[PDB]
Design a protein around this ligand. Structure first.
Ligand SMILES: CN(c1c(N)n(Cc2ccccc2)c(=O)[nH]c1=O)S(=O)(=O)c1ccccc1
Ligand SMILES: CN(c1c(N)n(Cc2ccccc2)c(=O)[nH]c1=O)S(=O)(=O)c1ccccc1
Ligand SMILES: [Cl-]
Ligand SMILES: [Cl-]
Lengths: 292, 292
């Protein structure tokens, strides 16, 4: 079975003053808190048992929003990150949560969208050995881990934030790991910046021949929310799809309902308190519409 | 083989004064003229032989932009629509262009986007009998043809712009027809509004048991450009994907290049005149990037 982890840590001061109010991942993308999207993403890969790592100060705030997840058929747990020592520390912090299980790590500020996303996540979640990551063509690969391919399409190198990228293929912030991830991670020492890097972990799988790098196609939307401009862009986007469709993106209640993790009576009950606004009215409509 | 048709007709005065300047389908969605999207859509379904129907006044303008299509591996032809007698008149006007072949009709102001769009269009283009259309969940099904399904998911009725819709499933403006389409069409008389309706044609296939209605999923983007607000929304959208990816949506040159309809020397030649701007630089980069 596969446990999940959301890294919803500090972005420091780089989005202040917006974020003096609350954590980045509490800020909304259009109509719902940023963290609903990566949560919804782990739910879509069929993952029910999730660890949220954030700062000591923001843990309670996430707790208040999300609880223990039992309202939605989930078991949500929390772990505090004291210092921003890199995202590969997620595995050490999360070491007893993980235990002997498989895992998935997602960034709390990435936004995914597209057709058959459920199936793309299934095929990486389905593999019970090695590691699986997604490469997505971007304008600015310097901002991310960057995968290099040989003429045959096989991954041959990874580099973290290179000043001179080998490709425009960025590694997305959504990752799948077998039971080897903790131990590889424990053998890491901090990078020149002073962080435990996810790229160093993925590289170790690569050298073992156990890294699968699947392409996320250009028909998928991968966005993030690292600047005020891009956050804004992300809101417009979702808003446009939602107002077009009469359907929501990353509605956790709906997803749990479609995963069969809660039933129509439980859904109606979550809808009860929110009946006056468009969101509770949306969850009520899902009881009596067939949506393909 | 399958011929294509683009209906890029009058929107009257309903977008004036923007459109006193030029036809709607000449207006740009972000960086390229509206008509590049439905053109690109027919190209993606593997269609090379295309009839553009527009007003007498706009035919030359389309001609000037697009030519005979031979620059892009296409054979583009033109036919004038004198009066706005409905979109089912496309088949009568287009009757000798169609001849004994299969066909596809697309609206000149619809925007499609998503993963495996190429494969969704292939599976309807592949069928050599009957008709195939796509139903897409929308907020406002009153604006469109609306398909009804039975508990099993089978189409059981179609209605044009109903005041009291049976579902939120709109029939998109992208349609595939066998050789029966002209004759069915010739048996149509104008609706109460005074138009030859596409819904009446699709209904006739439905009653013959020869209408396939495939769902276009919520992971696809279906947008249109009927109002100034929505046009604007469509531009933002495309712009967001393009600036994110460093990739274009509905670049006809690129598509013809990937269809193998033109070669790397022809592409370089189309790039030559546009070298100074971002678009010609984009076509040059496609000569030497591998894009999955
Ligand atoms: C639009 N997407 C989506 C989908 N596709 N669905 C339908 C669904 C729900 C569960 C498993 C497969 C499909 C849904 O109920 N809510 C959604 O937001 S999605 O696959 O692109 C998605 C799913 C979760 C988070 C972000 C996007
Ligand atoms: C993003 N899309 C797209 C794609 N997918 N491609 C790649 C491609 C090109 C030809 C056949 C299959 C895939 C492309 O070269 N240009 C594109 O705009 S698309 O399928 O959503 C599309 C294609 C044509 C018009 C509008 C969207
Ligand atoms: Cl794709
Ligand atoms: Cl879908």
């Amino acid at each position: 079975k596969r446990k999940g982890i959301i890294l919803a840590g500090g972005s420091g001061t780089r989005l202040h003053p917006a974020t003096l109010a609350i954590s980045k991942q509490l800020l909304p993308v259009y109509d719902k808190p940023m963290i609903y999207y990566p949560l919804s993403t782990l739910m879509l890969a069929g993952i029910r048992e999730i660890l949220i790592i954030s700062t000591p100060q923001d843990t309670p705030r996430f707790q208040q929003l999300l609880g223990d997840g039992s309202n939605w058929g989930l078991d949500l747990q929390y772990a505090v990150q004291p210092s921003p020592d890199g995202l590969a520390q997620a595995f050490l912090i999360g070491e007893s949560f993980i235990g002997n299980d498989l895992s998935a790590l997602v960034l709390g500020d990435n936004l995914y969208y597209g057709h058959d996303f459920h199936e793309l996540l299934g095929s990486a979640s389905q593999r019970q050995t090695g590691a699986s990551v997604f490469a997505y063509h971007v304008l600015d690969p310097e901002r991310y881990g960057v995968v290099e391919f040989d003429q045959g399409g096989k991954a041959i190198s990874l580099e973290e934030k290179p000043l001179e990228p080998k490709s425009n293929y960025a590694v997305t912030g959504l990752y799948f790991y077998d039971q080897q991830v903790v131990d590889i991670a424990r053998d890491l020492k901090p990078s020149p910046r002073g962080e435990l890097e996810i790229t160093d972990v993925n590289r170790a799988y690569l050298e073992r021949g156990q890294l699968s790098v699947e392409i996320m196609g250009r028909g998928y939307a991968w966005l993030d929310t690292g600047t005020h401009d891009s956050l804004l862009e992300a809101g417009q986007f979702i808003a446009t799809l939602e107002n077009r469709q009469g359907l929501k993106v990353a509605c956790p209640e709906e997803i749990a309902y479609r995963q069969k993790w809660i039933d129509a009576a439980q859904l109606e009950k979550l809808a009860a308190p929110l009946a006056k606004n468009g969101y509770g009215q949306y969850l009520k409509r899902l009881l009596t519409e067939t949506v393909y």
